Each structure stands twice: as C-alpha cells, then as structure tokens.
Design a binder for this molecule. Sequence first.
Ligand SMILES: Nc1ncnc2c1ncn2[C@@H]1O[C@H](CO)[C@H]2O[P@](O)(=S)O[C@H]21
Length: 214
Amino acid sequence: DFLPLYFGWFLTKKSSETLRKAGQVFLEELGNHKAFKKELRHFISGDEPKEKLELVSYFGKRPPGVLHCTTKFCDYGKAAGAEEYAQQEVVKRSYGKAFKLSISALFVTPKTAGAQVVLTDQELQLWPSDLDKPSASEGLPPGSRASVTLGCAADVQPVQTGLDLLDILQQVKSQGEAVGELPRGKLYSLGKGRWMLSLTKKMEVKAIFTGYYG
Ligand SMILES: Nc1ncnc2c1ncn2[C@@H]1O[C@H](CO)[C@H]2O[P@](O)(=S)O[C@H]21
C-alpha cells in the first residue's frame, strides 16, 4: 500500500567515505583559497568580521551515515507523482540492484555543499519525469538535478542541493576561465556565492538502488 520516504542510490560504506572525505577536503581547500576569501561578502550576508570562514563549520548539517543520490521523494505516497513513479517496471526491476554513479564535480553555495552526479542512460530511466518539476530543470538535460548532498547551512533543507545544482548548471548552460587549480581539478567562481570544482578524473561510487523509510 504505502511507499518509501524516497527512492535513490545508497552508497556503500566504502564509497560513501571516499566521497565524504573528498567533500571535506574541498571545503577546507576552498575556504583557504584567495579567490573565495575575496568574495566572502557575496557568500555571507551579515556582520561577520574580516576573519576567515571555516566551511566545514558553515555546512554543519551533514548526512550522519552513508551518502545517497535521491531519485524520487515519495513521502510514503503523499508526494505528487510518487505512486506513478513507484509502479514503473524499471523501478521495480532495479530495486536492490547495484549501480555505479559518476561524480563529475563538487560544488558549494551559500546554502549547500554537494556532488554533481552524471547519470548513465540506464540510470536516467530511474529519474522521475513529474508534472511538478522545478522550473530550473527546464532547458537542461533530464536528470541534471542528480546530486549527492554533503552538507547544508543551518536553516537549509537537503532538497536544496539539487535545486542549487540546477541553478549552477543554468548559469553555465557558455563557460568562463577557472579562477584556481586544486589538486583534484579546476576551480570556477560562478558568482553569488557559487563555486564549482570540476574533477580532472570523474569519481566512481558504488551504490544500491532501493527505498528509504524514516
Ligand atoms: N520535495 C522534494 N523533492 C525532491 N527531493 C526531496 C524533497 N524533499 C526531500 N527530498 C530529499 O529526500 C531526502 C529525504 O528528505 C533528502 O535527500 P536529499 O536528496 S540530500 O534531499 C532530500
């Protein structure tokens, strides 16, 4: 009768830790970077001092356990489109199956810290096509929203990560030069507190497609 809270790909303990660690390294490096410090007044909007901001602290709300990539939030069936999504053959067939998710970039905004996921064609079959889509997904390839949440600002909800990624991708839908080089790739400053690290080598994380119940 009733559905999960949401469906998605859940990373193994190992892959989760690899990505989490990479995310944390990025926050530390990004926060220490001259280009980021230079734009602090576009990132925070209060009476903060001239001092340095520690981003690991800023993104204080982090996933407590394994990371995941949400496909469809269902709220046990209360969410629009949940039933329709869950009844798809491909969803039922893929339930419990192993997949690999390709991580192409890490990003930061004043609201969230996340990882961009680039879904395979097979995985795109599990991406919902709802009647109620975020406006921002329009004009971009299906599944562009696909992401993993690494942290959130205090009053932010994990759903914002996907939304932030869509806004970043609309922003880059030409592309200017990078403002820095980090060990894992090039750093871009997209304005309005938004930052993207484009990985030289995509990370591959193992995960299982399944349903989460609160
Ligand atoms: N209305 C929504 N649409 C899409 N995803 C959602 C929605 N509400 C919550 N989520 C996501 O579902 C999970 C549990 O709330 C979280 O994983 P995470 O993708 S990081 O962001 C959250």
